[PDB]
Write a protein that binds this ligand. Structure first.
Ligand SMILES: Nc1nc2c(ncn2[C@@H]2O[C@H](COP(=O)(O)OP(N)(=O)O)[C@@H](O)[C@H]2O)c(=O)[nH]1
Ligand SMILES: Nc1nc2c(ncn2[C@@H]2O[C@H](COP(=O)(O)OP(N)(=O)O)[C@@H](O)[C@H]2O)c(=O)[nH]1
Ligand SMILES: [Ca+2]
Ligand SMILES: [Mg+2]
Ligand SMILES: [Mg+2]
Lengths: 342, 337
């Protein structure tokens, strides 16, 4: 997938965490928000690079999906041969086929939310284990709506908006504020709600989907150049698979190639600052910023243990081994701080 | 234009009001509502069949436009703005440009929105007495000059118009958005909860993602709308830039519906929207008739008892009352296309 760049950094972090006995730095959760059917689940899944999320026409995401990417060491290892999933609700059952994972999200949605468009705030908890992912939580959410349909109650719009607010009010989260290109940016429910929890725009990244669907005679040039609504962290256009493409089993590889071709053709001056890879790179930078901000905490925590193991040295092999391990940890911190992603 | 069918009906209704010496009822205002850029102004002007409304991307309609169609008696077409008083406009591109100018004068040149209406009269032999109201579309995030509470200002401006019980609401939703996300239908249901005066229009059918269509929406399988859900295809921004005519737009709309919605094509498109609206307007007309009827009876006995074995005027104005009752019956019996 497009978010492998941080793997060597988080491997070094894991070395430190193993010594310190605590996973002290937690990456922000990445939470996708926007109007129903704006292309949200497609964006989130593009960060995985594997097809595992129900996507489609009408209301689709009907429970929060807390999707925990879990990096797997070479020791705990087993391409479809190396990756697997576990759901909390299916206890210890292992999933190898990502199509079956997708179906189970749908299964578990139907069980709690019903089969006539109902929505539930109860999250589905999913872990995806892989040697090729970082430790990162992605959150898929129901999209904002206006008029109740199916089983939905009269106050469904507010139920959904309050549910979104609970996830993005988390200070340690990054909001992917999704708006479809075939709507006016000023009508963006994603940017409105993001500004309520993040008024200064320190953790909101604007994603513009469906660039391919814009009316003839129009384009998103002004939008993508920040000439409509400025958004500090970035405004990034993407092109994901159409419903036709989904129906035709179009691959992720072909989706990305066509997105590249599309941007080269219609937005040549802006192409290198747009697309799915650029969204990933932008996100990596935000995640690395969080890591760097937290290094002093980590360093201090090493010193706490270093002084403590040095003390009962003043269980003796235990102490000498740990001090060396903690000296190793201290060197690692400096290496991480000084890492810059290509 | 697409809405001439009521001309003969309002003409004979006028005769009845003339005869009874009463003021003719006003037809309800037709008010277009929806999210910014959903296709509202294109829908509203399609009921006129002349290009007089500014249309485009970004925020365009930034003042209400109260477009009063005025039927011209024998005893072509032109416009009059209240603010210019006397000047008459025969050039409809010049009318359009004046709407833009007036909008900039009061709302400024940086995306600001004003509740002050533009009053425009369009005089024609080929129109009925009818008021069409164009409104700024709903929004979420302030841009340019707009204050923090712009969304609420626009929404309450809309409510000011559609809260009028003598209004028909054209609830406009773009086909390239999920119907359940319709801000037009949400707001319409607030002022018209039983759907007695809300007509749903689905624009931009041609812009739907490949592998999708509005079949479920148009058959009432998503949100039911009592009075109807009617799909239309108006001119793209490319078509506007290229000055594509109304005639060509309608032809291509018809063709698109035949090709993509053959089973529903007869109950969709701009012509069907106009016919559906005429039928709604006819409903209002029939509801004024009992009032008119009782007034004819009062004047009838008032003229009849006035007798002496002047003495021929009361004789022929009794016959003009008899004529008026039969015209009322005719209106009730009239079928519309
Ligand atoms: N043409 C096009 N279609 C898209 C794009 N992104 C999503 N879609 C389509 O839009 C629909 C909604 O996609 P989804 O990811 O489920 O969005 P949601 N409902 O906001 O979770 C799907 O039919 C999908 O194929 C895009 O960039 N271009
Ligand atoms: N392709 C297509 N474009 C449309 C349609 N209706 C409106 N548009 C385009 O959408 C934009 C907004 O149209 P307009 O009538 O001004 O809508 P508004 N802003 O809601 O008053 C314009 O660029 C117009 O060309 C449609 O049915 N199909
Ligand atoms: Ca080392
Ligand atoms: Mg979704
Ligand atoms: Mg308009």
């Amino acid at each position: 997938g497009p978010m492998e760049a941080l793997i060597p950094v988080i491997n070094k972090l894991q070395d430190v965490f193993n010594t310190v006995g605590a996973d002290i730095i937690q990456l922000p959760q990445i939470v996708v928000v926007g109007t129903q059917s704006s292309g949200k689940s497609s964006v989130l899944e593009s960060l995985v690079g594997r097809d595992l999320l129900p996507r489609g026409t009408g209301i689709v995401t009907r429970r929060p999906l807390i999707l925990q990417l879990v990096h797997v060491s070479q020791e705990d290892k087993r391409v479809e041969a190396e990756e697997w999933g576990k759901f909390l609700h299916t206890k210890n059952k292992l999933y190898t086929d990502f199509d079956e994972i997708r179906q189970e999200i749908e299964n578990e949605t139907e069980r709690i939310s019903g089969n006539n468009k109902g929505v539930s705030p109860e999250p589905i908890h999913l872990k995806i284990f892989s040697p090729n992912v970082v430790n990162l939580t992605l959150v898929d959410l129901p999209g904002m709506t206006k008029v109740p349909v199916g089983d939905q109650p009269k106050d469904i719009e507010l139920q959904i908006r309050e549910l979104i607010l609970r996830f993005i009010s988390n200070p340690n989260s990054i909001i992917l504020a999704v708006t479809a290109a075939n709507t006016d940016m000023a009508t963006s429910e994603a940017l409105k709600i993001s500004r309520e929890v993040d008024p200064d725009g320190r953790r909101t990244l604007a994603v513009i989907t469906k660039l391919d669907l814009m009316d003839a005679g129009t384009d998103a040039m002004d939008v993508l150049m920040g000439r409509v609504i400025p958004v500090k962290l970035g405004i990034i256009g993407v092109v994901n698979r159409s419903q036709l493409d989904i129906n035709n089993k179009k691959s992720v590889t072909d989706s990305i190639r066509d997105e590249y071709a599309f941007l080269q053709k219609k937005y040549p001056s802006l192409a290198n600052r747009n697309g799915t890879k650029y969204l990933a790179r932008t996100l990596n930078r935000l995640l690395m910023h969080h890591i760097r901000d937290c290094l002093p905490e980590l360093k201090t925590r090493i010193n706490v243990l270093a002084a403590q193991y040095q003390s009962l040295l003043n269980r003796r092999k235990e102490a000498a081994d740990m001090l060396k391990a903690l000296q190793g940890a201290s060197q690692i911190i400096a290496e991480i701080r000084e890492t810059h992603l290509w």
